[model samples]
Target: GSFMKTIGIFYATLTGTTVGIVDEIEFFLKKDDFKTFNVKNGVKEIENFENLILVTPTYQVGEAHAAWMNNLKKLEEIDFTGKVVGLVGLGNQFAFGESFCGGIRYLYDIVVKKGGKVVGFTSTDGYHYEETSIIENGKFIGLALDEENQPNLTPKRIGDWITEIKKEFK
Candidate 1:
């Protein structure tokens, strides 16, 4: 309630791993007013906030989550002009080396098409992925998390990303 604007946090999860990552992200956002939602429930609530965070996980072979896939049509219809977005993608660097965090790229594209300003692009270090759609200009489009292989790094990565995006959101 203290923040001038409350962040709208949307998530798409199938196995709960992404949810845990979001909880950590929220832990860092504790001081700010925010609300979380499952993308499956629809993206109607997104209009309520000027800032947003999408926590998604790549499923299948470098594909966006099923929930996001379903919501894309509606999400694209929203007017994101002047909106601030911070992305977070969960991928298994060891298993899906070819398309690490590819799901988030889809969101990145949609946000761009919808005219949203993106921030929180992070360095792609300490990762052994072969390729990724999220990488542009030698940096990830957003914060990337890998709980399967590098669980220990998740906390710091999320924390640092929050610090960076807090400024961007303002």
Candidate 2:
């Protein structure tokens, strides 16, 4: 049989936290049917899969990863209206409380508008951000992980979110 990766794992990390989180995510998925793409390399592969996971970390203040910014030209070429995307966002809730994980908005803003079925929204109860568009009525737009302040909580959060979101992939 020919090999084909069913899921697209797209990510951009300034630091290694996003990479670490994706590593944990790979563990939960427990299968090698996913392919990794550094968003800086461009997002052309996104069109080849129906299941996708996009990871990003907040840079300074509220900006998304620089690689993501550089990939914008290629990013816009994909149509996500039929794709099922799981989102992972990391940030420092303590330092940038007012805009914590807000960089996820940059990711969200791009995919949702293109009509991706963004899943994996988690509870916003544990986070202490002053305010941000990353939250909805009572949920973070995606799985929000802050290893900077809540280091102890990240593993479980990543595990639990991966467990839940994988089921949504189709």
Candidate 3:
């Protein structure tokens, strides 16, 4: 017997930028097995799924959104062993070049520390940023979107990243 893999997409947003990205991601994913939730309200649901996707926006130069921070505190008490986690973040690369999309890095570390297998690292070829915590070995830890500066690219980037993760999630 076979089973369908379920993926929960958790997000924290302020000013709706991260939510926009989440909407795009959810649309591109187009699979009924995926679930979307705001971390503030769905922290408990995280440990229920084997696959996970986290979306957030960078704040205060390298911090997770306030809601994410609060939820993470609760999430730390749960075990995420053997879970596969993917990440996505929203930021203004031109306005906050030095710390663009840094929240994703923070979230990625949290997931990893909880024993989750992080996947879905995306290339940084088209983005222009002076610095960011999301970069590792020359690749963004996950998809990074700059809706403020590069709104036109968000859809394609999300679509492409979704394709990449679909392969890894399997």
Best by TM-score: 1
Residue 11 in model 2: shift from native, Å?
1.1
Mark the regions of model 2 whose C-alpha exceeds 4 Å error after superposition: 1-5
Ranking by TM-score: 1, 3, 2
lDDT of 1: 0.88
TM-score per candidate, chains pooled? 0.96, 0.90, 0.92
Q: List the residue pairs that clash in candidate 2.
A: none
Model 3 agreement with the true structure over 114-147: per-residue lDDT tens digits = 8887888888888888866788777999888888
What's the C-alpha lDDT at position 21 in model 3? 81
lDDT of each: 0.88, 0.80, 0.81
Clashing pairs in 1: none
lDDT of 1 by residue, 1-170 (tens): 34547889999899899989988988998988889999889888987788899988998887789999888888888888989999999989889989888898888888889999899999987888776778878899998888988899999999999888888784
Model 1 RMSD vs true structure: 1.4
Angstrom error at residue 169, model 3: 1.6
Off by over 4 Å in 1: 1-4
